Amino acid sequence: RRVRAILPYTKVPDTDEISFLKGDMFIVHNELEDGWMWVTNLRTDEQGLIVEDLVEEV
Amino acid sequence: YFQGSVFGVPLTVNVQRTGQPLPQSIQQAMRYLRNHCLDQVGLFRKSGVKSRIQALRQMNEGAIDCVNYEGQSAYDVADMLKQYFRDLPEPLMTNKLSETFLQIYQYVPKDQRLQAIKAAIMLLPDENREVLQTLLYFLSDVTAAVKENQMTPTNLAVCLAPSLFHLNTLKPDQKDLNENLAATQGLAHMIAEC
């Protein structure tokens, strides 16, 4: 399952989130509660947490 | 360890000096957040201000009297709590507990994960268990106002797990990233059911 970012976002400091730009595609590794997803950003090759509110399925 | 110091002091020294593992400054901070701040949108997420947080730490350290938090930004106090749990000599949830959560979410089936988490918490020291019970009650009260602050248990976990577990962040191996994810999941599970 892959998703695409529809909006840029900057990581909250000292957290497991990941920053991304508008258009960044992610591969979803794990789906957590409350729409949170552990994903790998394909652009930067970094793993982290993103929210479902900023991504769209492809 | 210096007399009257709050930050960087392990819970056992706090017990030997006062009788309670959490300092009264930190408990008063939690009470202030519970009383006047539970409706602030984005609590523990929206960053405070370095000057105000440093002033709050200035207030905590060395003060023999009671630390008053009235007239302070909620986000400053929340970030101060995150920094206190970050600045502990050992993490509140011991370095072994992140690995234990990884083992639970990898090899323990989903219907018994809560029982394994409770057992793992029971394997912690008494001071850590008391502080964790207090903090879990506080975070449950915080997330109870999710209609006002939009802070779901998983959101609170994302914001607080690095401070509670002393996790690493990249800009780290795969095992450590799995530990981070499992620690966040376990913290969210504990907050959601408290």
Numbering used by the authors:
A (entry chain A): 282 to 339
B (entry chain B): 1070 to 1240, 1258 to 1280
Quote the authors verbatim:
Deleted in liver cancer 1 (DLC1) is a tumor suppressor and ubiquitously expressed RhoGAP protein; its activity is regulated in part by binding p120RasGAP, a GAP protein for the Ras GTPases. RhoGAP proteins are key regulators of Rho family GTPases and influence a variety of cellular processes, including cell migration, adhesion, and cytokinesis. These GTPase activating proteins (GAPs) downregulate Rho signaling by binding and enhancing the intrinsic GTPase activity of Rho proteins. RhoGAPs enhance the intrinsically inefficient catalytic activity by directly binding the GTP-bound GTPase and contributing a conserved arginine residue, the so-called catalytic “arginine finger”, to stabilize the transition state of the GTPase enzyme active site and catalyze the reaction. One major binder and regulator of DLC1 is the RasGAP protein, p120RasGAP (RASA1; RasGAP, p120GAP). This was the first RasGAP identified and is a key regulator of Ras signaling. p120RasGAP is a multidomain protein containing two Src homology-2 (SH2), one Src-homology-3 domain (SH3), a Pleckstrin homology (PH) domain, presumptive calcium-binding C2 domain, and a RasGAP domain.
We determined the co-crystal structure to 3.2 Å resolution, and observe clear electron density throughout, including the key residues that mediate the protein-protein interaction. There are 4 copies of the DLC1-p120RasGAP complex found in the asymmetric unit, and they are experimentally identical (RMSD between 0.3 and 0.6 Å over 251 Cα atoms). The p120RasGAP SH3 domain latches onto the DLC1 RhoGAP domain using its RT and n-Src loops and additional contacts are made between these latches by residues in the β2, β3 and β4 strands. On the RhoGAP domain, the bulk of the interface comprises residues on the solvent-accessible faces of αF and αG, with several more contributions from the αA-αA1 loop, αB, and the FG loop. The most notable feature of the RT loop binding is the direct interaction with the catalytic arginine finger residue Arg-1114 in DLC1 RhoGAP, located in the αA-αA1 loop. Specifically, Arg-1114 forms a salt bridge with the sidechain of Glu-298 and a hydrogen bond with the sidechain of Tyr-290, and additional van der Waals interactions with Val-293 in the RT loop and Trp-317 at the start of β3. We observe no material conformational change in either the SH3 domain or RhoGAP domain upon complex formation when compared to the previous apo structures.
